[PDB]
Amino acid sequence: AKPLNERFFIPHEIKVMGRWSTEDVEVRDPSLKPYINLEPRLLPHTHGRHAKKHFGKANVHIVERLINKIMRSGGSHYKVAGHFMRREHRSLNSKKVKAYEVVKEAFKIIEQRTGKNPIQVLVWAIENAAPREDTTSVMFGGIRYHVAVDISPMRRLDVALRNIALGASAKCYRNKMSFAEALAEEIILAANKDPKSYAYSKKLEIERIAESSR
């Protein structure tokens, strides 16, 4: 199926996946710039390290975080698109090889469709899917009040990545679309800002609720 050269690809430079560079990737907002990591690294695989260290996620490549995020099952105790996706033995959890292949295919599809760096498109998608305000309860006197609060950049990034992964899983669930195709569509739509993307829809909903409870 796939060409033998691609099967036995041998990188020679230090760039993400050995195919895409990060020299020209730009982050606009100053809030997420410190946490959005574009360090030169051809293997986005840090194993389980940086979990123990507090604030250790600021030094993990974007692709590694996305791979870890998509390495899951979806659903479980939460409903997205109004359905559970409790897949136990068919899940990608604990399958980093499969998650890596999925991310690679999604990046290839994004590059083919858009003509731009897939990592740059992912940065745009994360920016557009990052919320800025939420609602939380505060306990004073003897009663609680709902109050609108800000979101730290780390939580913004985590929520954006989680929303992208859940959206891709939801639109690949029990359909004819492959998981890589679903991920590529999610990233493209999130970058394009159309409400069709689950990440952007959730960001808009969170912001609207924050405004209402403001």
Partner RNA sequence: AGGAGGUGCAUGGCCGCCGUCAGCUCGUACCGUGAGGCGUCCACUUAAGUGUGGUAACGAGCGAGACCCGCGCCCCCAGUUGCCAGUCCCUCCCGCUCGGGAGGGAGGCACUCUGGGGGGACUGCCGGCGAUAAGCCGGAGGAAGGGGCGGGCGACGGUAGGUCAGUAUGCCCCGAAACCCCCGGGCUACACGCGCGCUACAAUGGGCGGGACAAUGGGACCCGACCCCGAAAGGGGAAGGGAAUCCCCUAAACCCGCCCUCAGUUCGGAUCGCGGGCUGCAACUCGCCCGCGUGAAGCUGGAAUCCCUAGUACCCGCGUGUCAUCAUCGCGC
| 28 vs 52, beta carbon nearer RNA | 52
Single out the residue of 127, 143, 139, 145 nearest to residue 197, CA to CA.
Answer: 127
Binding status of residue 1 toward RNA by CB under 7 A: yes
Q: How far is the CB of 57 from other proteins (least distance, A)?
A: 17
Contact between residue 37 and residue 54 where contact means Cβ atoms under 8 Å apart: no
| 108 vs 193, beta carbon nearer RNA | 108
Binding status of residue 169 toward RNA by CB under 7 A: yes
| 97 vs 139, beta carbon nearer other proteins | 97
d(CA 157, CA 212): 23
Q: 3: which DSSP letter? A: -
Q: Mutual orientation of helices 198-213 and 153-172 as an angle, nearest 10°?
A: 130
Using CA atoms, how far residue 157 sits from 65, 128, 177, 196, in Å, is: 10, 11, 26, 20
Q: In this chain, which of 178, 192, 201, 213 binds RNA, going by CB under 7 A?
A: 178
Q: How many CA atoms lie within 13 A of 128 on its CB side?
A: 23
x-or-dash pattern for RNA, window 46-85, by CB under 7 A? -xx--xx-x---------------x-xxxx-x-x--xxxx
Q: How far is the CB of 89 from other proteins (least distance, A)?
A: 10
Footprint of RNA (CB under 7 A): 1-2, 7, 47-48, 51-52, 54, 70, 72-75, 77, 79, 82-95, 97-98, 101-102, 168-169, 172-176, 178-180
